[PDB]
Structures are given as structure tokens and as C-alpha cells.
Amino acid sequence: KVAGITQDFTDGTTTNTGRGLDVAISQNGFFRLVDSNGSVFYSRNGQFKL
Amino acid sequence: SFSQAVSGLNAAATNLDVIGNNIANSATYGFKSGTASFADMFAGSKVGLGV
Numbered sequence: 469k470v471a472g473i474t475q476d477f478t479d480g481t482t483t484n485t486g487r488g489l490d491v492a493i494s495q496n497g498f499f500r501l502v503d504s505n506g507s508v509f510y511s512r513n514g515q516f517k518l
Numbered sequence: 519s520f521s522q523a524v525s526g527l528n529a530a531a532t533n534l535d536v537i538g539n540n541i542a543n544s545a546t547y548g549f550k551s552g553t554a555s556f557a558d559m560f561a562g563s564k565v566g567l568g569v
Contacts, residue, residue: 479562482561483521484559484567495562
């Protein structure tokens with residue numbers, strides 16, 4: 469019987485990109501985001517634009 | 519990986535653009551030459567990141 473699927477929160481490789489609005493956390497953490505309805509989510513992808 | 523090689527390729531191009539600029543402007547009358555300087559990058563880990 470398959471018990472359950474679990475993630476893996478090992479830190480990835482930091483890779484250099486060069487552009488302007490991009491951030492990367494180097495230890496544990498998340499960014500806090502809000503939808504236009506009002507719920508709160510937590511993310512780790514750091515591609516941002518205006 | 520691929521990222522360190524592509525950063526080295528990208529940083530060895532301004533180091534030729536600023537020498538081609540001096541080679542071109544070595545005949546004018548009020549010019550001051552230029553140069554570039556590099557510096558390594560590092561994340562939290564111990565392996566390097568590029569240039």
C-alpha cells in the first residue's frame with residue numbers, strides 16, 4: 469500500500485542570470501503573495517515584473 | 519556547469535570591446551583610455567558561481 473508522496477526541500481543550485489528583477493533566497497524562507505481576491509500564498513520562484 | 523562557462527564567455531567580451539574602443543580612439547586628441555576589472559561571485563555554498 470502506497471503511503472504518501474512527500475516533497476524534498478533541499479536547496480538548489482544558485483544560477484547567475486544577469487537581468488534586473490530576480491531574487492533568490494539562500495536558506496529557508498518563502499515570499500508572501502496575495503491574489504486579487506484575498507488569499508495568501510507562499511512561493512519560491514523569483515521572477516518579477518512590473 | 520553551463521552557467522559558469524557562459525558567464526566567462528560573457529565577461530571576456532567586454533574585455534575585448536573596451537580594447538577595440540582604445541584601438542579605434544588611439545588617434546584623437548583629448549582621449550583617456552579605459553579598462554575593466556573582474557570579481558568572482560559566491561552564493562552560500564562553497565562551489566563557485568562564475569565571474
